Scaffold this active site. Structure first.
Site: not given
Ligand code: NA
Ligand code: NA
Ligand code: NA
Ligand code: NA
Lengths: 252, 252, 252, 252
Positions: A143, A156
């Site tokens: 990501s 995250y």
């Protein structure tokens, strides 16, 4: 021929929708026999139908990547259904925003188990199968948070930053087994922007101004990236993360 | 289809041998009409014959990328011979090692003009043509020296580190013209290891121990990487550098 | 004055020996009142004596950073003993090598809880205290494994790569509370090379050849780095990781 | 003591104003005898007066870093005036924005000669002096453009990206002479934002939203960073670039 995956056998986790579905279908379109997982078998119906459209075989199995046992047994079962296993895409991921002062133990665990620990133990299981046969390719879904920090997405970002570390160390350790390990960091993709968060139009305008291509990613913007990293065209690429982000990271 | 380059028109500079030759031939094999340059036309004979083997057209022209005029006129001439221009590979490069206390002005200039300045002015010329039509893709050849430092390769490393900066800024600036700009950092490739330096076997043993795949790159290890960065599979990749290095950068 | 920490109040976790001890003592030498933790209070005897040598106050408390409750209560207790809290060094870490095919759930957990999760929950607790007063500085201890991969150190590398992600996201989120968050990636330091692994002399020779300074780090090579990141000299530095590695990362 | 520069002898190029002036004065405040250069001696009047305020000696000399001869002779003259030379700050830089289709040869040259080539040849000259005595420290001024791309700042970004490559290769090559080589990438600093470009308030608002600290850098935000990189506190740091950017690079 260099990009062809005919006769390869792939497993793609968390493949009911979004990125994982895109990757799974693109693998099938490039020649591969594909196994796909999700929490329930029934949620894979669209992914299975799109794969079988290619003529190829689709195996579909229930799996919670938070259960370390299911990481192993459902990966081995995927191998049995396909007759082997030489591609793994670790896509499964729990997304979350929460002020860091308000993150409790349980939330931390759900995020990191799903996004980081799960992918390790799926890699380990697919890896051992590959190592006993003739090797293969692993692709981890990272990501933008592997490169920068998003406020309130701390667990995250830890997960996905960790997974990039996992990608590099496994690549280094498993090259001797003919197993390549690489990653894709999707930017902002339409199909992943379901959460209520993303309709905030000021946010959208602000993010688009940070992306040189001034657009969010489509499924065609990632499927071919995953095929590439699995193909003979990427024989000398390992331990690397390709960002598919319309130029976000490169840009001021 | 996603990796197909049929009907694309490419220019690859410094393509008589090595990496540039590999890339040029792989572009032709993926469908493209290819123009190739070098100092002399006669040195392109092997590259031209390998391209015309694909059935496709090969244009061949003399060019010194140190001459800013030739960067423009020979790029425009390449366009005319092909009937257009929508792929540029900036491969041309002067390699050198020299203790930094012993680098004089002239050496600095030869290295940086060739490796950095030349690629800018070729990009500018190909860019303007692409911008006036429907865009295209540019691929710059960077190096491990874009990421780490090699002692006695200081001007060279400045060049290739600079070219990565060029890749990012041009990507950001030219996305609005539908021009993607990316790079490949080859690791240690057999076909580029001609210099007397590389037969030193202790060096070879030491370098191989830093590469997880324990091998040097073949032409098949880069050609497909260049095709990929030029293809619709890489539509959302811009301003990025893919290292093809057998895991060197990822590894301790 | 720009590097002075007089009147600052610091907490350094896992500070009985090695890096953490070095950092704690250097903070005290720069002016700070310092609290130090470890598994047992008795193991802090050397660290406490070296701090009290500076004339400053040393608080010492038992803490297992794997217990999320102790991450909070022992951090709050450290604040009470000092009369406040405006520096946190997350040093506590479990080091490990184990072939990745042989990593079980329990090992994964011990490594990641200690190295990543613990540091998050200590940060959260120190952060909330800082946010309610006038801010502060947090320094996370990362590793070369935040940048490259070490084979058989996969969970460890995930931990430290994750912690770099944590450093960036917390920096971004907590700048509005006047809390800076940065990291140090120690290279190979003599005081951390206790494990039997490191006496292997071929290993030592090989690693030293990758380090331009041809030496392993001393305590003087990191203490001042931590002071710097906590000082007014680093007022515009946040979300950054300084490697102290004798040039390893910069070098081919 | 660890941050003290008493008795060190420094040269700071392009030090009449801005960053270079800030660094030069901070070096003098930390104990160093400082030589400063600019195009004319008369433009150094403010910098000289601020240094002599510390009680220390200030040498001031004319220098165009585009003249490779002046890079050497004016560096040697700086050494003679100080009685030695063991710190170099390469600050001198020509800033520019220009659409890349409109960059001509001359502009390219002015930017790259000043920003990259000049710093190499100053480094070479200071380096040789340091290598003949007992070593020293070099600090290069890089930029956010060493990490990302700014549209229309392509030659500039090439320069500063190249200089980061120079920092890494020189660090690796010159560690054996006890010469450390590091860099600082300033973010957006008030004192460097003179150009008409920067008053555009929409730009200002947009940039500030990308900076977690929501402010532009002051002279206190960089001076101490340069002192640190020159001090014994940074003995194990070489080939590294510290961004002083209020969290810009770390932030989404
Ligand atoms: Na960006
Ligand atoms: Na490496
Ligand atoms: Na290195
Ligand atoms: Na940013």
């Amino acid at each position: 021929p260099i990009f062809d995956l005919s006769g390869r056998r792939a497993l793609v986790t968390g493949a009911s929708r979004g990125i994982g579905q895109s990757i799974a279908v693109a693998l099938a379109e490039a020649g591969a026999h594909v196994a796909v997982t999700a929490r329930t078998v029934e949620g894979l119906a669209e992914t299975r139908a799109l794969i079988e459209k290619t003529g190829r075989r689709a195996v579909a199995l229930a799996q919670d990547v938070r259960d370390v046992e299911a990481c192993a047994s459902v990966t081995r079962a995927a191998a049995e259904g396909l007759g082997g296993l030489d591609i793994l895409v670790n896509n499964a991921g729990f997304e979350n925003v929460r002020p860091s002062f308000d993150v409790d133990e349980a939330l931390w665990d759900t995020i990191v188990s799903t996004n980081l620990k799960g992918a390790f133990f799926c890699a380990q299981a697919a890896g051992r199968i590959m190592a006993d046969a003739n090797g293969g390719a692993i692709v981890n879904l990272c990501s933008l948070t592997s490169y920068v920090g998003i406020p309130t997405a701390v667990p995250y970002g830890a997960s996905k930053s960790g997974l990039l570390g996992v990608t590099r160390a496994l690549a280094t350790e498993w090259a001797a087994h003919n197993i390549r390990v690489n990653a894709i960091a999707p930017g902002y993709f339409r199909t992943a922007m379901t959460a209520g968060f993303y309709e905030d139009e000021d946010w959208q305008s602000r993010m688009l101004e940070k992306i040189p291509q001034r657009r969010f990613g489509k499924e065609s913007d990632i499927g071919g990236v995953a095929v590439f990293l699995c193909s003979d065209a990427a024989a000398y690429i390992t331990g690397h993360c390709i960002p598919a982000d319309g130029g976000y990271l490169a840009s001021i």
